Amino acid sequence: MFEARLVQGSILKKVLEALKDLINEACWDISSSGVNLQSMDSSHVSLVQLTLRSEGFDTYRCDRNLAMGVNLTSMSKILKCAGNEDIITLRAEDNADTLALVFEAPEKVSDYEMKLMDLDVEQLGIPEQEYSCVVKMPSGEFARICRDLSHIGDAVVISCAKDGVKFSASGELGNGNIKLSQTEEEAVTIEMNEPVQLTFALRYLNFFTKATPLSSTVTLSMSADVPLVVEYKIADMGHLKYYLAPKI
């Protein structure tokens, strides 16, 4: 039996708001280590990897490992019923076709029973890498950039160098270029082993940005010819990583 209690229910609300639009169905792997989820969007251009360490929960219990096929859209509709102050408890049985979510208003107790589903998932083996460029910067700042360059064009060219990173876009109206110089939650820092310049589809990035409320900062890891990794560290829970395949 699996039962995890989270006082900060808002985190779980935020996670789903950060995923439902990118991925509609996904397998939730529950282990004594915590909740893990890896999924690829329909077009297989991006990939998500969510990790919520068992230590981030006020209470956590998992006798036997579970793999719950969830419809994120549906789970999202259920979480919207939780207030931002509710204590969220997840509970599932081993031979169960359902997931139980209990919200406790900080005299209101809500109990939902979400039906699960069968999923023919496809998972990727992503080894630990040391990227050529790792940019740490304010998540709101990153969000602004993506939203904006989007009006200018479809793709963004991220150039990373030691003393700053540059985002560029081009369209029929002209071109746009934003330069961020290496400057707590308002700083910009770069760990660059080698300069890198990549081209990415702004459409997918503006989906990742839907995770901004999970962190005051985000990190961008790049290396030539490899998918970009945009990470949002869920405060003392774990993190949420978005991978974006480069353009050609």
């Binding site: 251009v45 699960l116 589903m117 069968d118 998932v121 998972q123 998918p227 050609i248």
Partner: peptide, 18 residues
């Protein structure tokens, strides 16, 4: 040309019953 994530990493299909 938009490449796919499967172009870079080894995939392993999983059947989930629930």
């Amino acid at each position: 040309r938009q490449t796919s994530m499967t172009d870079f990493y080894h995939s392993k299909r999983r059947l989930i019953f629930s």
